[PDB]
Point group: D2
């Protein structure tokens, strides 16, 4: 027996904070977290303990360490069917990755509405607040491969599969409210331009290259989502701390047949929070799995990701009431003009068991709707509807991908479709066609109705000639980017300028950079001049005179577009590094850990080596990581308790820890002799907003630090950071 | 509701004779026939009655008759996800057919041994007479595609999957005891030569073409299995009336570790029976699904196919005691030298529910052995072990083909293999490698032992240099063909001659016919002369003087090599055509039908049209088929009862029915005025052996006809048939 | 050398009547018959005469009769890459057959218009009577698999690929001028009804079974093409002796932008001819490849299929 | 076979040999080469047995394995010399 005597190889099946225990398959970590979808998966879950090792044909294996050979130094024999099965399986493990959003992290949970929405939709999952719908959600980046890094600058995907009693509804959204392009015909062009360039397949996970900006400079429709991608929206702190949006206007249809236009939103109950660019990029090297790890560990801790589903509802008669087209997916609906109605809450409370079986093989498709919802003529949505069925044919091997366990509906499904590769279901129906008499026409069509009825499209009037032509109403490109820009805080605006400046600096052909700055001058002169200055470009007299685009329906700004404008920070689930020394003041540590525990904030005890240190009163404190092993990039704030500061005071890694946190605008707290460190980050003797300091770590020191943490970062510190060499 | 109100759309769930009821899925025809495998398939069986029609995502469909369009005469819209799911699934229904044995028919059943074989093999399925093992068997042809005809001249496959408690064992055999070639390296050449020629893909289901006989003429090792394919072995009456053989010498290993060489046999309990060529060839047009149909309907009628498993056992010390090499798959082991020891019985007693899901996707492979069995160095067997795992990667879409329901073991299977296309099992093991400590090394290897132990290969000694060389002991080609020839009856020999003659007459290049005739002269001068005379070829004096090959270990014949030399007739499950007229003698028909029913022989009542006819006493007689609709090819015998014979006496189809049955050597019985048909087949007044005739169908008439049916055909009629124009 | 000394293994590269010579690949039977498509395929045509037998990696093979073993009666060794490449190729020869029209026979040829049709269409292949367009045509049955018989009762497919200067135009028609159903949404229902029944996969190449007539009796829109199929149109004598039809109304668009509705027809210049049922059904037994053979041999004989 | 779609992956341009390659293998997904050989098997007379095996030799010969001596039982065992 190879497991250690003490059983420390196995994590406890109870919630534990990040790093306390090795992570595990969800059904082992949380065996009593149940929902109807997780329960239906029991028929395919396979255990292991106490079973014999076998071939796939059930034959017990005696020696799993050697090939069959003629003599123990002889040649391997073709009759070794154990070796061949095992190698053949391995040789075929991989399937094609997703064309876009290949990199993603997924979890199970459930959804429940706050009230019946039957006045606006007959969708069964929205019909009663006691209706619980299991979900599986996958969050993703867009551009990079399945093995690229999490904290890149990118749009993020936010796909939710609702397993309803009336079919699977997939809400396949992103973390920004518009897309880059207007018509699906252009999708392969836009995606080719953003993906690694075809000759050499560089760069991975970055839009910072010539072909992306070439396309943007030639297609001004892109500029709105480009603004969002260059803002800190492009670098979220966590998939728990970003918004989601369906982007398209869809329709809700009620039992009376009335259609209401709807745009879908997810509001993060943990608040909105993003990284800063230097932190994000460095973190792609120090932990490329940071967001995947954070999501898994949040759920292991009981810090469940929670989102409120929201609807923007516009009556059919208000179709043409705005100065933009509701069907244009490059336009957002400002919340100031159409508020978001909060309709339900989704809680992700269990990790998968096997990443490939449940996450990699999950198939989400926006065409998967249910009675009570309907599409619109948004021409990007229209083209999506073709792609997500088609792409699964190659990615998941054929047309029976709905029989892969994670994709199966939990409600009944019966029809006349048969065969195809890896057909699981064995149909007993005498008939495989309809109409038929030989099975009395079963399974049978169902008329549309208020509940449990068949799907009928809303009978929208279509009048026009067959054309390949963009609606003139879509031909406005600068007013929403400007609305976005004006709605950001001045620090958010600086981060946008810096995002454009950094990316355009990586464009080798300078005329592309010039053409992009010219586009910025159509949006906002301040933004254009700031970027231009960072690129060594001077705006012409003509560019300085471009008339700003008009306001959006009399809107000057909308603070709901800013990440930070309106306070909504939550500290539960965040993490603080505590930098130890070899003789820590245990009185400090007791107070710190107590205050953090009360607010659900986690801690990581860091030192210059692994093992344990001993506190002044003999308490043994287990070390989680070294200074270099768990960089400040991975935490939200840093606390340095009192004790033997000479032990770390000249530790390069300890000093650098605080300089990096400082640079990235993180709260820092220094107790007693830890205040020696003020010299490394150049803090004046009478203190500075964002640096908590006291004689010791009492309860008043912790409240200050926790208050800074609720504001996320110390934005007032930005003009001081240019000086620090970190 | 489109079913007839009387309920006649639905077959009775009880055994019923062929043609009495529409055929149906196994689980609907025979719901109470169960075995452990059939039960384990319940998790994937899908019903239909009383369910709503849905998409594959579970969304009810309202209108399954129309695409979504703009106006009821307008264009179809891309947003119709219901049409596109349905057509996408149809568009991808087909998977590649099997490279060889693509045409096949399958059933479920069970196996039980007569006694424990613990003394000679530790195989669990052979350990206890009370141990029942479910099986699935597929019978097949070899050359034609899955849409080719059943009653071609070909070898047939007989593949059995035994779902044992210690793993799947697949016994993948043919209906002749040898193969065409000696070394697997030649398999693609041989198969390419027999398959349709590559420029024009002709001929389907036939070896009667140039490239096949070219290869034969150049590779004399093929002659033995060619003799068998040219015999009436190549055209079996049914899958129930052929033998099966695993061909290769394998090993049995007991718990003391002793190896015994074994060849496997299946003996058909229904007896051995074949068609004649003209009948077989015409039947491929009148009913290209004749064997598939006959198998299905036998099982529906309760005439379960039964076979007895037998072993030829040779002690390890006797490996070299024969004139031929035991490892050479072109050599049989005569039952006169090594008798077949009866081992157990297999009964096939339930049809599949869905042919694609269960038959088309079943994967058999002779590498699938269990502890207790092992391989030998037979060089054809050795290459087979490579091919059957490789080919499923494309055929069945990836390395998870064992998770396709029909292929699943019923015993436990656990290992460290993960992922692959279409992965069903969700593994919860923390470890995907061994050795591991994090799951205490589970699942674990199992030492070999007497029951439930791990697989270990028998430690055969290997000694030799690495060579691509045929053993000299394999270099003998003519003695086994001659033993086969000499063992046949004289009418069997005539059919062999006619087989070679017919096939070679299709070879366009005359020199190939000449080269084959030369090979035949090395086997037997009588055979070579008689084929030569049919091809207009004169043997040279050299050919006339070739000395015959030696006997096989002193044997000049072995009657177990003949289909007919030892009577083994069984009438149960056979079928008689009854040719009605419009005023049948009901007394005759009472006597005929009840005598057939008493022996389990089926009848089909035929007439010049469908519907009913009324007997002399008013009994209403339902007609099964017309004389042209169900030709004599499809029955074993023909009875014409008395009545108004002038009604059919002038009917060309009725007369031709008898002439065809007569030419094909079937028993014919004529009652009363039916004897007027004697002039049609040119029977003398005083009658002839093989024609039953009387004033009425009473006394010994039916007993006589049944005695003829038991001898299968009237071989003594062969000289009398050459002159009849039919 | 294995060939006969008289050279009788090799067909004459001249037109010959059916049966006079073994049949052969087109480029060997008629090396001088060319067209722009045929020529373009020269980059991938592979000969054989005078070349060494090799692996797919170009390594010459010394012994293609034996596996590598440890002693001549010993086990086969895994390091035999020659054996495994050859068997791996063979094991993966098959690809899925077509969902419908799996059974089909094809030939190369050329088309040219009798006069310019520029007044009614701007299609380049119809613009000039002296501009030739290569074609590739496949004729087919509908229901049976790729190994089913040719002279079944069925509708026949007649598909033409025109390799034009402005792109490929495929005219994908059948031998009757209508189809069985009105809406594509019903195609899987109809096809499943005509195809072998799903429990036992019977019957092959035949609409003569319950599910097909069940569908017909419940969908009277099928009756028109069913009448066609039950007539002698259902059992053509040869692909050379049937009509073709595009079935649907399409549009022609001229340079001025005017649209004209059009239905397409092929007229067999060999005339229309069918078998009779008893003959057709017996021929599926005696020669299940009869239409495939007849087409190939008409072309080898110079009896080229012509259609207007 | 899964990665590159089937058994014709040596026909993908970067994989192709620059020297001659000829044999009797046929078909497979994505088959590019169009074989004109009347025979797809050997031995054949109909194409005078081309393409033909080549004896091993000093240059341009067929591949023959070195005739290394093999001696021992069929075992799943690590050589003690590896431990
Ligand atoms: C080196 C290749 C090779 C050789 C020498 C053989 N086979 Fe084979 N056989 C195959 C390669 C193969 C295969 C390509 O792997 C098939 C086709 C698809 C499949 O699953 O297995 C197959 C299928 C196949 C089937 C159909 C199984 C089913 O119903 O699915 C039977 C009954 C046999 N074979 C029997 C034999 C016998 C009795 C052989 C000689 C003693 C033999 N085969 C030699
Ligand atoms: C509105 C802009 C769009 C958004 C927000 C969007 C969102 C997404 C998301 C979130 C995923 C990943 C789902 C998962 O987690 O598995 C996805 C995958 C995909 N999308 Fe869309 N998408 C958009 C536009 C398109 C368009 C216009 C097309 C086609 C023209 C498209 C084709 C695909 C394909 C092919 C995949 C891979 C899906 C799979 O392989 O299962 N995307 N997209
Ligand atoms: C109007 C009546 C129809 C005619 C004349 C027609 C014609 C044909 C023909 C001639 C082929 C064979 C092409 C070849 O030689 O390879 C074919 C194949 C096919 N047809 Fe159509 N068809 C018709 C209706 C349809 C409909 C309505 C659908 C779809 C709903 C359809 C789907 C297919 C598919 C999937 C194939 C196989 C193609 C391939 O695998 O390459 N058929 N059809």
């Amino acid at each position: 027996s190879l497991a250690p005597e003490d059983g420390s190889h196995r994590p406890a099946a109870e919630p534990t904070p990040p790093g306390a225990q090795p992570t595990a398959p969800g059904s082992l970590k949380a065996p009593d977290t149940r929902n109807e979808k997780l329960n239906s998966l029991e028929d395919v879950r396979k255990g292991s303990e106490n079973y014999a090792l076998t071939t796939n044909q059930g034959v017990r294996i005696a020696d799993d360490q050697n090939s069959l050979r003629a003599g123990s130094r002889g040649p391997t024999l073709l009759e070794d069917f154990i070796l061949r099965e095992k190698i053949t399986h391995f040789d075929h493990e991989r399937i094609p990755e997703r064309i876009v959003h290949a990199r993603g992290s997924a979890a199970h949970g459930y959804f429940q509405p706050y009230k019946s929405l039957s006045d606006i939709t007959k969708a069964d999952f929205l019909s009663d607040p006691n209706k619980i719908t299991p979900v599986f959600v996958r969050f993703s980046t867009v551009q990079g491969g399945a093995g690229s890094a999490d904290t890149v600058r990118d749009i993020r995907g936010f796909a939710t599969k609702f397993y309803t009693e009336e079919g699977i509804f997939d809400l396949v959204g992103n973390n920004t409210p518009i897309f880059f392009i207007q018509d699906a015909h252009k999708f392969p062009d836009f995606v080719h331009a953003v993906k690694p360039e075809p000759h050499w397949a560089i760069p991975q996970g970055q839009a910072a290259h010539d072909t992306f900006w070439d396309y943007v400079s030639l297609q001004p429709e892109t500029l709105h989502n480009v603004m969002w991608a260059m803002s800190d929206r492009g670098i979220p702190r966590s998939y728990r701390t970003m918004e989601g949006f369906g982007i398209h206007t869809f329709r809700l249809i009620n039992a009376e047949g009335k259609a209401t236009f709807v745009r879908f939103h997810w509001k993060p109950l943990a608040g909105k929070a993003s990284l800063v660019w230097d932190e994000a990029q460095k973190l792609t090297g120090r932990d490329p799995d940071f967001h995947r790890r954070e999501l898994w560990e949040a759920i292991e801790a009981g810090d469940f990701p929670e989102y409120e589903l929201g609807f923007q509802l516009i009556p059919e008669e208000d179709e043409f009431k705005f100065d933009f087209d509701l069907l244009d997916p490059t336009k957002l609906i400002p919340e100031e003009l159409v508020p978001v109605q909060r309709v339900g809450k989704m809680v992700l409370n269990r990790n998968p068991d096997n990443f490939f079986a449940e996450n990699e093989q999950a198939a989400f498709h926006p065409g998967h709707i249910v009675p009570g919802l309907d599409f619109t003529n948004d021409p990007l949505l229209q083209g999506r509807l073709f792609s997500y069925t088609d792409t699964q044919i190659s990615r998941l091997g054929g047309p029976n991908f709905h029989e892969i366990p994670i994709n199966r509906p939990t409600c009944p499904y019966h029809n006349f479709q048969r065969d195809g590769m890896h057909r699981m279901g064995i149909d007993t129906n005498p008939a495989n066609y309809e109409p038929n008499s030989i099975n009395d026409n079963w399974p049978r069509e169902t008329p549309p109705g208020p509940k449990r009825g068949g799907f009928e499209s809303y009978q929208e009037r279509v009048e026009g000639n067959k054309v390949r032509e963009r609606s003139p109403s879509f031909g406005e490109y600068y007013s929403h980017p400007r609305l976005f820009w004006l709605s950001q805080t001045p620090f958010e605006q600086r981060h946008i300028v810096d995002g454009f400046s950094f990316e355009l600096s990586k464009v080798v052909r300078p005329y592309i950079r010039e053409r992009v700055v010219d586009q910025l001058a159509h949006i906002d002169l301040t933004l254009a001049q700031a970027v231009a200055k960072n690129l060594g470009i001077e705006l012409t007299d003509d560019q300085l005179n471009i008339t700003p685009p008009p306001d959006v329906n009399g809107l000057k700004k909308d603070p709901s577009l800013s990440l930070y404008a309106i306070p909504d920070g939550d500290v539960k689930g965040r993490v603080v590094a505590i930098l130890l020394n070899d003789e820590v003041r245990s009185a400090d540590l007791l107070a710190i850990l107590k205050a953090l525990k009360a607010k659900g904030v986690h801690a990581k005890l860091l030192y210059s080596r692994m093992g344990e240190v001993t506190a002044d009163d003999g308490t043994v404190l287990p070390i989680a990581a070294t200074f270099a092993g768990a960089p400040s990039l991975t935490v939200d704030a840093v606390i340095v308790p009192c004790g033997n500061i000479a032990d770390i005071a000249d530790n390069g890694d300890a000093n650098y820890y605080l300089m990096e946190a400082y640079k990235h605008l993180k709260p820092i707290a220094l107790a007693g002799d830890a205040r020696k460190f003020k010299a490394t980050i150049k803090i004046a003797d009478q203190g500075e907003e964002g640096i908590v300091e006291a004689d010791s770590a009492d309860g008043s020191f912790m409240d200050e630090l926790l208050t800074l943490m609720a504001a996320h970062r110390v934005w007032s510190r930005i003009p001081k950071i240019d000086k620090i060499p970190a």
